[PDB]
Design a protein around this ligand. Structure first.
Ligand SMILES: [Mg+2]
Ligand SMILES: [Mg+2]
Length: 510
């Protein structure tokens, strides 16, 4: 007898461009839970047990899991949370002041204190997220150094493709020890000699795993409610090694930066993202291939839980496919269990019946084959998408919603453009570090809403004389445009404005 996998699917792990396509893939999704709260926690020399909460104005934007033990969520106001926790530590985010080109933390201030001098008025202030962008960047530098392929899914989430690391570790690591008596080089000498030997057809089946390797330990919580054998094939051997490696990367994030992370480990991104949100914080959820259906049917997940099926598209599928309200995943598998063609024939008929409503439908009748395959694999937990890089920036905006008189004249507009130009510059610096190239916006757009909520807009070029000398250039143009729009206003209902925004587009990366 022999393994269910081939050499092709194992060698593929060494290819950064196609390792994800292999059923032996080892993907990881790492999430820094309540990231903003973790950042403020560390900044104030606090511990994970101190119940910090990141406040914006009157709302909570991040809840440390110490504060969640008191039932605090993002739906509560600070006053509601104070009544839930009397030792709460609300920390307000950094903030610009109207007319200043720098942001500043006002620790000890906020709408929850009584002293009127310790207030952070919303009327003449704008939030700054630079502290979080800067800390997130530090995490990526740690990720990108331990993994040759990293996707920044968001400011607090990343995917890793541990393919190359797992493969090289499987075939060449001579230092790893299963126990005090057994090293990897000895337990896997059979497949290593077979690989160096080269006497295999790439479509030949791998040799059976040796009994020696079942001593290999998973680092983390292996999701296994049915008590299946842990190491039953090479997919589990790869996944086990990846759990060890991934624990080290997550411990680097905590030893260098102090941030905790929940993690999901499997053979596909969709499953990895579900696993990381299954147990948190400071957790690591492993989903073997032989436990994929157990995981998708554990009760937490429905068809709408997948990355792309949460919106209108998902809800239309529930009606077209006549899915139950619970266990819709299991229903998809069993209603079309043989092949995606069955589901494609079902979709083709449905869109071809009477009362199809093809004019408003979100189901493209020409790509029913691509869709049927997507659902067929997601429901079986084998829909592997590649780790894509963050698309290059096309547009940035900084705006402020103005309630009251905080923008009654031209001078008040310029004061806000000074804030907008500083945030856009900060956000361009963070990009120049990610792209490792210079970033130059070539056109600027100002738009504003009058007291009657009518819109005035004007765009144009920004003449960077030298190179990357923004935050003065584009404030010139910003002030020129807001002046023109004043003259267009003139004897019209204009001030006090209700909204003001600056948008930069047409970037040149060099
Ligand atoms: Mg998240
Ligand atoms: Mg000023």
């Amino acid at each position: 007898h022999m393994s269910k996998f081939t050499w092709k699917e194992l060698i593929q792990l060494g290819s950064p461009s196609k390792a994800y396509e292999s059923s032996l893939a080892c993907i990881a999704h790492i999430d820094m839970n309540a990231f903003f709260a973790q950042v403020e926690q560390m900044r104030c020399g606090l511990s994970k047990e101190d119940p910090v909460v990141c406040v914006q104005w009157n709302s909570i934007i991040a809840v440390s899991y110490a504060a969640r033990k008191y039932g605090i969520s993002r739906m509560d106001t600070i006053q509601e949370a104070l009544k839930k926790c009397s030792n709460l530590i609300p920390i307000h985010t950094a903030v610009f002041k109207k007319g200043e080109d720098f942001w500043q933390y006002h620790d000890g201030c906020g709408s929850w204190v009584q002293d009127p001098a310790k207030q952070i008025s919303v009327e003449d202030h704008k939030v700054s997220l630079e502290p979080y962008r800067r800390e997130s960047r530090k995490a990526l530098k740690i990720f990108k150094s331990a993994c040759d392929l990293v996707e920044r899914a968001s400011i607090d989430e990343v995917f890793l493709d541990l393919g190359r690391i797992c493969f090289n570790m499987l075939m060449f690591d001579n230092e790893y020890e299963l126990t005090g008596d057994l090293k990897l080089k000895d337990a896997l000498s059979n497949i290593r000699e077979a690989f160096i030997g080269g006497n295999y057809d790439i479509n030949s089946h791998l040799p059976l795993i040796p009994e020696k390797i079942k001593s290999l330990k998973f680092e983390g919580d292996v999701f296994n409610p049915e008590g299946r054998d842990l190491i039953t094939d090479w997919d589990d051997v790869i996944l086990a090694l990846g759990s060890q490696v991934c624990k080290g990367i997550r411990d680097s994030i905590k030893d260098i930066l102090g941030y905790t992370t929940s993690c999901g480990l499997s053979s596909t991104k969709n499953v990895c993202k579900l696993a990381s949100n299954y147990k948190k914080p400071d957790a690591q959820t492993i989903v073997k291939n032989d436990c994929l259906l157990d995981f998708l049917d554990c009760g937490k997940f429905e068809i709408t839980s997948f990355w792309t099926l949460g919106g209108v598209l998902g809800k239309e599928l529930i009606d077209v496919l006549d899915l139950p309200h619970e266990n819709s995943i299991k229903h998809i598998r069993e209603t079309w269990p043989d092949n995606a063609g069955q589901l494609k024939e079902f979709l083709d008929a449905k869109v071809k019946q009477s009362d199809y409503d093809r004019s408003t439908s979100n189901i493209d009748p020409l790509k029913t084959a691509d869709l049927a395959e997507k659902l067929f694999k997601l429901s079986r937990g084998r829909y592997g998408l590649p780790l894509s890089s963050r698309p290059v920036v096309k547009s940035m905006m900084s705006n402020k919603n103005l309630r009251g008189k905080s923008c009654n004249s031209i001078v008040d507009c310029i004061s806000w453009l000074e804030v907008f130009c500083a945030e856009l510059t900060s956000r361009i610096q963070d990009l120049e570090q990610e792209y490792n190239k210079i970033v130059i916006p070539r056109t600027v757009s100002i738009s504003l809403k009058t007291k009657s909520y009518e819109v005035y807009r004007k765009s144009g070029p920004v003449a960077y004389k030298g190179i990357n000398f923004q935050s003065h250039e584009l404030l010139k143009v910003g002030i020129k445009f807001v002046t023109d729009l004043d003259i267009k206003g003139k004897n019209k209902s204009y001030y006090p404005l209700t909204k003001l925004s600056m948008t930069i587009t047409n970037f040149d990366i060099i």
